[PDB]
Amino acid sequence: IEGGWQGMVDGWYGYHHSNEQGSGYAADKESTQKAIDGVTNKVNSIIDKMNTQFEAVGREFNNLERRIENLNKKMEDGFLDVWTYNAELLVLMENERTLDFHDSNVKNLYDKVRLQLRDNAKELGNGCFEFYHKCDNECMESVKNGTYDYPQYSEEAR
Amino acid sequence: IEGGWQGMVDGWYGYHHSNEQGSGYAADKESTQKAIDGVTNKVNSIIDKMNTQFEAVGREFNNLERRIENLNKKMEDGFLDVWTYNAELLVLMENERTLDFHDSNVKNLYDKVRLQLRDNAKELGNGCFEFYHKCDNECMESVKNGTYDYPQYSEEAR
Amino acid sequence: IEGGWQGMVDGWYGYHHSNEQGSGYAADKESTQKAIDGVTNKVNSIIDKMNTQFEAVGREFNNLERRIENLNKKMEDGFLDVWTYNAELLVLMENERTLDFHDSNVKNLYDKVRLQLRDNAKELGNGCFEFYHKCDNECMESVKNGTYDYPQYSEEAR
Amino acid sequence: EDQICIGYHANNSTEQVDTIMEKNVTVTHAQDILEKTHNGKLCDLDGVKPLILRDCSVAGWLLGNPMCDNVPEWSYIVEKASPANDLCYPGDFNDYEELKHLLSRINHFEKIQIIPKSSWSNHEASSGVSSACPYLGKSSFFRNVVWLIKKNSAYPTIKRSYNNTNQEDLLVLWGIHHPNDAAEQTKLYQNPTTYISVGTSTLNQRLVPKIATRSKVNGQSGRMEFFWTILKPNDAINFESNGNFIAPEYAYKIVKKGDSAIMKSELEYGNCNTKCQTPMGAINSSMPFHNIHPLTIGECPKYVKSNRLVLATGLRNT
Amino acid sequence: EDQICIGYHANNSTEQVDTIMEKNVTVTHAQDILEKTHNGKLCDLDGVKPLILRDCSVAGWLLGNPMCDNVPEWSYIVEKASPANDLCYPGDFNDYEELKHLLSRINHFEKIQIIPKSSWSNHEASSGVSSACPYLGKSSFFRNVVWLIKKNSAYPTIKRSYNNTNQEDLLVLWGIHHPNDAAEQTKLYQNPTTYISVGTSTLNQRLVPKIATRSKVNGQSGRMEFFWTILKPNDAINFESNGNFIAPEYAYKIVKKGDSAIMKSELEYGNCNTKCQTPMGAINSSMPFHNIHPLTIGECPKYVKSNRLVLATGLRNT
Amino acid sequence: EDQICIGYHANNSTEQVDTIMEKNVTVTHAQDILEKTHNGKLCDLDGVKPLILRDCSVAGWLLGNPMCDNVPEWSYIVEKASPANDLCYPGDFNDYEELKHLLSRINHFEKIQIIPKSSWSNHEASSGVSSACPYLGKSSFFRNVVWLIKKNSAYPTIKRSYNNTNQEDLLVLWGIHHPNDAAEQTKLYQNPTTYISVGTSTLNQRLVPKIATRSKVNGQSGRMEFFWTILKPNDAINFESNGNFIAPEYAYKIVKKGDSAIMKSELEYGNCNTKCQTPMGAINSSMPFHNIHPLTIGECPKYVKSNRLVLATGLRNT
Ligand SMILES: *[C@@H]1O[C@H](CO)[C@@H](O[C@@H]2O[C@H](CO)[C@@H](O)[C@H](O)[C@H]2NC(C)=O)[C@H](O)[C@H]1NC(C)=O
Ligand SMILES: *[C@@H]1O[C@H](CO)[C@@H](O[C@@H]2O[C@H](CO)[C@@H](O)[C@H](O)[C@H]2NC(C)=O)[C@H](O)[C@H]1NC(C)=O
Ligand SMILES: *[C@@H]1O[C@H](CO)[C@@H](O[C@@H]2O[C@H](CO)[C@@H](O)[C@H](O)[C@H]2NC(C)=O)[C@H](O)[C@H]1NC(C)=O
């Protein structure tokens, strides 16, 4: 693949066809919805699993209690280090994950299509197939929701 | 692919053939064992890396020591928040990982087979191949442990 | 694939060709550099995100302050457990990740090539293709930086 | 001729996220999980208004410092970092930090008179004043305690008792005067050797004045040291002294449920509600992390040393 | 005609796991890593039986409260949250929480007589009793300390010494009586002004009785305040007093290695062993997490606020 | 005939990493993020040399123990675990752990004479010595405080004052002698009943000697208990006593900015610099984790209980 489509605005992953009757963009609504859920459900997980019980923090010690005030500070910025480090990394890690998820979904869409088409279509290697034969919109709409009939165009490529 | 097999009971990943001599289920014992190890080894890692040294927890302070009793509680449920959050997420994250691992292994088994078969077999797109020619059990058993001989059935598909 | 190449020393991922004019090894410098960056950038992330502010740790309590000395120890080896567990796992997890990253990159290199070659080359299933026709070094060098011309050798395989 | 492509959505979004491998990667849609926004005010904590001490310390407020300025309940307390006036007459407050912590969050609080200033028949009840405690430039003294001195060259032994007839715990405060020589001791209290014994069912106290030569503070070298106790319902407090006694007059009805802390902040009230309060202002509690200020009170996001914590939701751009 | 498929195992398993993207995903085989199971009993901690104080406080047990009921070693101590009887004669115990913590885990512990009650020749040794400390309804007093009063209108100065001739540290307890007026002081101890000085190689003590008017507790307004010290082997303890002295009779041989804590729990012993003990019952230590109770003692899984922590091992179902 | 292969680099590397699924996987290139290396020495902490007390305790060093051996600043303090000599004359040091913590990191520190030993005209200033404090085998005493006793059968009341005329906070130390009988009290100080009152603008002290029969330590049964205070600039300290007073002679100019701690370590200085110091030696601070010793001082990697934390950078081998 090469880049993304500004044209495709009704979903995350999808198709762009170009036959005799003309061109068009279309989102793969099933795989787009499955993905949006996951990503959403991920963000919610990172947010909601936080416990956040009532706590009150403050300096409560005098000039002759400097040792315990120090113990307080040690644990106070002990957790500060734990939380910072893990929040920083949690984000960095799961972002790598989200972006890998997007690649997978895009390829698994491409691969679900390549299977149906077999040899009668030409893998241009840019994310497109160029039919040897001709596809009306009934052809195209069959490939997208995955009801493709190979027992029709089956020989014409010869 | 479509779903799992109730029939396949001697392993995690495997094959189901159907020729003239009849049908059958079979587990891919090498890839099944490699996977079981990993998953097991993962669970062990999450369990054994826990340090768990001897500690004794309790209220040890009086009515005029309420400030330090509070410091105790702050750190006590400070760690409670750290552990809860990270254990919750650790599980959620590594589960995503385990289930992705299972997909990969299933596909990498399919893909190791598609390579051998080349054009003389028909990718039905459901996880099965339908031979143009005929396969005895000697054929089938060769595909499974991966000793397939293409320099035999090589032309018959024409 | 089968194993790695001792011969290939100028990069992480690459090609080994063998035509009439002779054999050779070559690194795919673009995908090799993209990968080295990522891995480096990962290690840096794990190192630099550590906060490490100035702290001073020590026993500061007397024989009649054993309770607070104990509170100190509790939090002291509270964090010891948190850090140990998370550092151990952080490593174990991200290693799985790095090694998966390497597989992906190797396959995505193989797959970028298989696309160009189509049917006129034979997938040996070991990471190599064996041309039905003949490839000079101008052919080979075109496949590597990905400027391959299929509208030339297009028919000769028949 | 005919073609079908597979592709992914892109847009005008300029937003960047980071990865454990790459940095500054542009993204379609994103989420920020770091609250970095506050309202610059002190606010109610879940319905319950805070007690803001304008420029008094908890001590001065409790004792009734005249230089200082009724609230039935609060969730937390706000002092400034250095309150202008604390102990007008120089001295000390015993177990002060514990009392502060106790008072941090009070469910009910009502000042009541327990020993009427009028009731002191054999001791001079109205001359315990000092220029260190001025009211409208006139010598005064903490309004809630009585600085008793001698009447007609004599300081009879005091025996006073108060029974907690209320349904609530009572916070009682008293004090002792540490004079600066033996001459002042006899001048004020006649008796050269004095004590103050105080007892409840749990308290067993005997205080003895400390004579010392001290630097002047607020033009006074003598000292007042204060003590407190919680008196349970149906319990009695028994005061006995032959000098230096700073008697209680007013005590406090007390109902404590939860705990909280004392916030040091320069800010002001904002007729405002929050779930999480900061010395720098109130913040929203939805996001899992914040970076405003470590010394929060409430149900608060985790405090973190980060500038941006942004999570990629969309995809890569063009 | 001929076919070969690739597929994966499925079964009758109904078990569900969660993912950072999806929820309630059915699974072939699974693992739970959250221990949520306890045995509802108090148990040995790694071979070493606990010291369970039925309804005494550590204090009352040590001093020999008559209203209370030999164990050579323990791993931890169990009091109930509010032990029925603590200090039969009202009073106080100095550095009590520290002593409790010290006694939390004792390797060896043996009660020994150090000053025989008989040996008091010039002081009345057998009338220090009170109805606040009843034994079978008869006035008694802590069995381990002696409340000395005057003999024939006289209280000679006491000088007693004990040399630690044992091979072990000795825990020694004594006390002082805080009477409630001067009349009682002379009634009991003759001398109007009394002291108790106590010294070892490290201890330098001088206690002076506090006379105060106090609410009655257990029908007594006077008070007993107790003190302790650890006496090293070969060291001596030197007691000197002219009144209000609550002498030691029994002390304790002590061997301390590790530390532990005092558990508050209502449960009972179960002839049972564990590696991790809870106020609610003993638990297994294999799993990395638990959710029973935060106040554990032993080698314990991490305490976590979760209901289920389940890890997917198998695969998705049909 | 003609072929093109796809493959990956391998080498002679023998290094192994671990995975959450597999173990001991051989790898092309790797990174270790666990510092396990130290230099076995005590070093400067960011330019600022430590104060190493050879074999003195902070107390003995401050008071001028004769058995002990000028430094204007330090980052941390190093005592041995049990310093050979602490309090030569047996006794005690009040709020000692707080003073230690205060002194942990001092920006400026200069000893100055505040009350000249010569200035004591009515009290014997040069006989306060003991064999417990030997200097070259001759009876001596802490060099920084003066043990005053009576002159010509008389101990007049002392009234001394010192005004802090310096631009810096002053650390002042004094003490009291706890004799062991009434005879020694009159022998040394004439007056049977003594006190020591000490006052600044914040301090209000009255100490009274404790007579007790004590085990001998360093052949002395009497005791010295020491007290300290910080005297702000322009403030005065007022000492008054009629006996047992261990007067100050030298005090300390003090400038405190940051804090630190007291390290217990047997090691020695190494003319060496670090960012992170350990009781076992100085370590590099680049790596995110270390496993040397938990009691670090500085900007330190996180202390972890691991033997190896190695991160795979290269790829699998052959
Ligand atoms: C304080 O006063 C209360 C109220 O009278 C006393 O409580 C009563 O005590 C008498 C016996 O002395 C009983 O008959 C009543 O049952 C008690 N009344 C209540 C409401 O409990 C109380 O004893 C006094 N407390 C002190 C310390 O003197
Ligand atoms: C307590 O008694 C012991 C036992 O006699 C004393 O220790 C002995 O002291 C003498 C010198 O006074 C020495 O000859 C022995 O070597 C010591 N014996 C042992 C076993 O150490 C001890 O000094 C006495 N302690 C006190 C504080 O009086
Ligand atoms: C200690 O001495 C200083 C220095 O003289 C005193 O400070 C001065 O006080 C007088 C009034 O008494 C003023 O006129 C000056 O303004 C002050 N000088 C400075 C530099 O502040 C100080 O009061 C004395 N302190 C005590 C406690 O006696």
Ligand SMILES: *[C@@H]1O[C@H](CO)[C@@H](O)[C@H](O)[C@H]1NC(C)=O
């Ligand atoms: C990333 O972007 C930020 C903010 O625009 C910029 O300051 C920085 O130089 C960039 N950093 C890297 C490593 O590209």
Ligand SMILES: *[C@@H]1O[C@H](CO)[C@@H](O)[C@H](O)[C@H]1NC(C)=O
């Ligand atoms: C998941 O299953 C649980 C337990 O059976 C049920 O209570 C809950 O409604 C389900 N939650 C979701 C988000 O599907």
Ligand SMILES: *[C@@H]1O[C@H](CO)[C@@H](O)[C@H](O)[C@H]1NC(C)=O
């Ligand atoms: C891994 O290698 C280490 C060190 O060489 C060896 O001690 C251990 O037996 C090995 N462990 C496993 C699980 O293979």
